């Protein structure tokens, strides 16, 4: 039997707002993405995940949707969306879209009606509760600052919002609401969408009665919001009434949920989701407040990957990513973005990303080795989540503004949202106007045009790796085995399928290191290396590794 197309596919995440502008408004659009499909094809990309593209007031840049069946005005029209589809299909490429159905915008017609009165037909499309003892219904905190409950004077009741105040949560306990969501999903699937990514999929179910969070739960409220009693009931239903009738791939963003519960989401026998986005790895060095950083080693890095691989079992599947629109740049976060180590480390992380077991996602710009942004003003940090950090930590005296910005500089979501660097023209060729966010000044050295013409560039190395994975089934669907989980210098693991075994070795130190193969293992061939002066001799039992050297080898 064969493996599904998505298990051996290489995905590329486009954040349309910051990818390519074509009308000089400073905002990326659909026409921009369409003009760059050849670039993505040439890289070797099989499928594209785009961030929300629906009508939105943009208080959270598309994650506050005011009309699920209309296209965001900034990105273009429905015609532009269809053309994007058609141009993708002509290149044998597939499209995955973002599905945001934990909540909607407060400008959605459902909510405008819902808030009108207690007897409105749409009232139960959301959660409305009376205050308690002169205060909020309960002690729920919002991800984006303050209470998760917001009072509305129109009726005197509070509505629930896990995130932004302009992002009220949808009530999945209401059957009529679920049917509306299902019909909306079919609407896009009938248009030929090949994949769906479910944003904060683990929070769909709310706990009956909304009791107060215990002191312990209050600490880790992200986890507590993923413990709704009817969650998997709703996910199985959505599969039965929607995805069972189509051949699209489903990807869940499982944020807040402990690893041991992930199988419930991705076990194919359960008929829920196909693969999972987990955040144990990408947040392995983030503190509980989601803005402080905690020092970690390669040991912690690889042991997390191990635990994540183990919950796949035989019937489940993982995605793999080192960066997205919500996190700092990969080379800055996991590598060394200093000008003498940036390219080398970026190539090293590319080797990891494309030799992991699971479906790899590459975030726009990482193939160029783009870096974190050098923030210098208040404005640079402008984001709804940072506004919330101010509300919860600065205005309350828990921390000074400078303390917040010092740490957020390393963790800000805006680090990943600076305009794609196409060339070295004005604003890196992203726009002919003023970009909605400032272009990283290092675009003079870091841009696509220069990378594409250089066989030693980061882009060329990614492109080479993508070709190798596509021609080596073991590197996609093969099994995973960490050689030494306790090693903090050199990351090494094997990929095996059908008698074929491959070895991956990556030095994470900016210093020369040595690696010794397991007893009875020898190098047969060298597929690729970065920062290496010479491939090992055939039959070698060990490797001499340069600083930040990475490689892939077929072994005996
Ligand atoms: O914003 C975050 C990342 O730093 C998290 O607090 C967030 O809870 C989580 O990453 C959820 O992700 C998705 O849901 C949000 C929708 O409200 C949106 O802000 C994120 O961009 C989207 O990725
Ligand atoms: Ca535009």
- Sheet with 195-198, strands from edge to edge, namely 275-277, 249-253, 195-198, 94-99, 47-50, 11-14, 359-363, 319-320
The annotation places the binding site at: 21, 23, 25, 27, 29
Measured from the alpha carbon of residue 166, the closest ligand is 1
Is 255 touching ligand 1 by the criterion CB < 6 Å? yes
Q: How far apart are CA 404 and CA 399, in angstroms?
A: 7
Is 167 touching ligand 1 by the criterion CB < 6 Å? yes
- By CB neighbour count within 10 A (0-12 exposed, 13-18 middle, 19+ buried), where does 237 fall? middle
Cα 164 to chain center, whole Å?
19
Tokens 């159905």 found at: 101
Instruction: Report phi then psi at 537, rounded to 5.
Output: -70, 150
Instruction: Report phi then psi at 110, rounded to 5.
Output: -55, -45
Is 199 touching ligand 1 by the criterion CB < 6 Å? yes
Query: Cα-Cα-Cα-Cα dihedral of 365, 323, 141, 437, to 10°?
Result: -10
Is 385 touching ligand 1 by the criterion CB < 6 Å? yes
Q: How far is the CA of 26 from the centre of ligand 2 (A)?
A: 6
Tell me the pairing of strands 157-160 and 500-507.
Answer: unpaired
Q: Which two tokens mark 99?
A: 């599905």
Measured from the alpha carbon of residue 289, the closest ligand is 1
Helix (H) or strand (E) holding 530: strand 523-530
Is 60 touching ligand 1 by the criterion CB < 6 Å? yes
Tell me the pairing of strands 94-99 and 47-50.
Answer: parallel
Is 200 touching ligand 1 by the criterion CB < 6 Å? yes
| Nearest alpha-carbon partner for 471 in 8, 32, 104 | 8
- By CB neighbour count within 10 A (0-12 exposed, 13-18 middle, 19+ buried), where does 420 fall? buried
Resolution in A: 2.2
Q: How far is the CA of 433 from the centre of ligand 2 (A)?
A: 9
Q: How far is the CA of 387 from the centre of ligand 1 (A)?
A: 14
Method of determination is X-ray
Q: How far is the CA of 29 from the centre of ligand 2 (A)?
A: 5
Helix (H) or strand (E) holding 184: helix 175-189
Q: How far apart are CA 75 and CA 56, in angstroms?
A: 11
Q: How far apart are CA 242 and CA 27, in angstroms?
A: 33
Taken in order of first residue, the domains within the chain and their CATH numbers are 1-104+175-478 (3.20.20.80), 105-174 (3.90.400.10), 479-556 (2.60.40.1180)
Q: Are 227 and 203 in contact (CB under 8 A)?
A: no
Q: Are 231 and 150 in contact (CB under 8 A)?
A: no
Q: How far is the CA of 246 from the centre of ligand 2 (A)?
A: 33
Q: How far is the CA of 88 from the centre of ligand 2 (A)?
A: 20
Q: Are 439 and 430 in contact (CB under 8 A)?
A: yes
| Nearest alpha-carbon partner for 330 in 285, 363, 289 | 363
Pocket test for ligand 1, best of 199, 220, 384 (most atoms within 8 A of CB): 199
Q: Long-range contacts of range 475-480, CB-CB < 8 Å, 24 or more positions apart?
A: 475/354, 475/355, 475/502, 475/552, 476/3, 476/7, 476/8, 476/357, 477/3, 477/7, 477/8, 477/357, 478/357, 478/502, 479/357, 480/309, 480/356, 480/357
Return the ligand 1 atom nearest residue 100 CA: 16
The annotation places the binding site for Ca(2+) at: 21, 23, 25, 27, 29
Concatenating the DSSP letter of every residue in 457-525 gives SHHHHHHHHHHHHHT-GGGTTSEEEES-TT-SSEEEEEEEETTEEEEEEEE-SSS-EEEE--TT--EEE
Is 173 touching ligand 1 by the criterion CB < 6 Å? no
Neighbours of 143 (CB within 10 A): 21
Q: How far apart are CA 488 and CA 295, in angstroms?
A: 13
Q: Whose Cα sits closest to atom 23 in ligand 1?
A: 326
Enumerate residues 6+ apart whose C-beta is below 8 A from 226. Answer: 202, 203, 254, 255, 256, 257, 261
Q: Which two tokens mark 56?
A: 């939105």
Q: Are 141 and 147 in contact (CB under 8 A)?
A: yes
Q: How far is the CA of 63 from the centre of ligand 1 (A)?
A: 8
């Amino acid at each position: 039997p064969g493996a599904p197309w998505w298990k051996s596919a290489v995905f590329y995440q486009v954040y349309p707002r910051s990818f390519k502008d074509t009308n000089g408004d400073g905002i990326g659009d659909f026409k921009g993405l369409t003009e760059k499909l050849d670039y993505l094809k040439g890289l070797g990309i099989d499928a594209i995940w785009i961030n929300p593209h629906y009508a939105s007031p943009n208080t959270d840049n598309g994650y506050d949707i005011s009309d699920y069946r209309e296209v965001m005005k900034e990105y273009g029209t429905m015609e532009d969306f269809d053309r994007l589809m058609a141009e993708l299909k002509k290149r044998g490429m597939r499209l995955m879209v973002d599905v945001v159905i934990n909540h909607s915008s407060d400008q959605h017609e459902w909510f405008k009606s819902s808030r009108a009165s207690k007897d409105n037909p749409y009232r139960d499309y959301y959660f409305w509760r009376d205050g308690k003892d002169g205060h909020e219904p309960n002690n729920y905190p919002s991800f984006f600052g303050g209470s998760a409950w917001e009072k509305d004077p129109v009726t005197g009741q509070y509505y629930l919002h896990y995130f932004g105040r302009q992002q009220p949560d949808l009530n999945w306990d209401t059957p009529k609401l679920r049917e509306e969501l299902y019909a909306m999903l079919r609407f896009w699937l009938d248009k030929g969408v090949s994949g769906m990514r479910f944003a904060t999929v683990a929070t769909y179910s709310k706990t009956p009665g909304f009791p107060d969070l215990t002191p312990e739960q209050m600490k880790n409220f992200a986890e507590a919001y993923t413990q709704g009693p009817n969650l998997h009931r709703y996910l199985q239903e959505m599969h039965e009434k929607v995805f069972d009738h189509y051949d699209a791939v489903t990807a869940g963003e499982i944020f807040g949920a402990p690893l041991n519960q992930v199988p419930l989401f991705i076990d194919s026998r359960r008929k829920e989701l196909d693969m999972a986005f987990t955040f144990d790895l990408i947040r392995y060095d983030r503190a509980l407040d989601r803005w402080h950083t905690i020092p970690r080693t390669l040991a912690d890095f690889r042991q997390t990957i191990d635990k994540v691989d183990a919950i796949a079992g035989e019937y489940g599947w993982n995605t793999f990513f080192l960066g997205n629109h919500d996190n700092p740049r990969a080379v800055s976060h996991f590598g060394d973005d200093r000008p003498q180590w940036r390219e080398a480390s970026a190539k090293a992380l590319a080797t990891v990303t494309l030799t992991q077991r699971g479906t790899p996602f590459i975030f726009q710009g990482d193939e160029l080795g783009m870096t974190n942004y050098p923030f210098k003003t208040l404005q640079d940090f402008d984001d709804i989540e940072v506004k919330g950090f101010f509300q919860d930590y600065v205005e309350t005296g828990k921390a000074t503004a400078e303390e917040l910005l010092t740490n957020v500089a390393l963790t800000s979501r805006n680090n990943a949202r600076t305009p794609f660097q196409w060339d070295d023209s004005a604003n890196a060729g992203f726009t002919t106007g003023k970009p909605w966010l400032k272009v990283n000044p290092n675009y003079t050295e870091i841009n696509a045009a220069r990378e594409i013409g250089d066989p030693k560039s980061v882009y060329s190395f990614y492109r080479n790796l993508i070709s190798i994975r596509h021609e080596t089934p073991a590197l996609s669907t093969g099994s995973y085995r960490d050689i030494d989980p306790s090693n903090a210098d050199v990351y090494a693991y094997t990929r095996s399928q059908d008698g074929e075994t491959y070895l991956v070795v990556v030095n994470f130190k900016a210093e020369p290191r040595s690696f010794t193969l397991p007893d009875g293992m020898h190098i047969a061939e060298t597929l690729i290396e970065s920062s290496s002066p010479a491939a090992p001799a055939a039959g070698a039992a060990s490797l001499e590794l340069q600083p930040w050297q990475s490689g892939i080898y077929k072994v005996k």
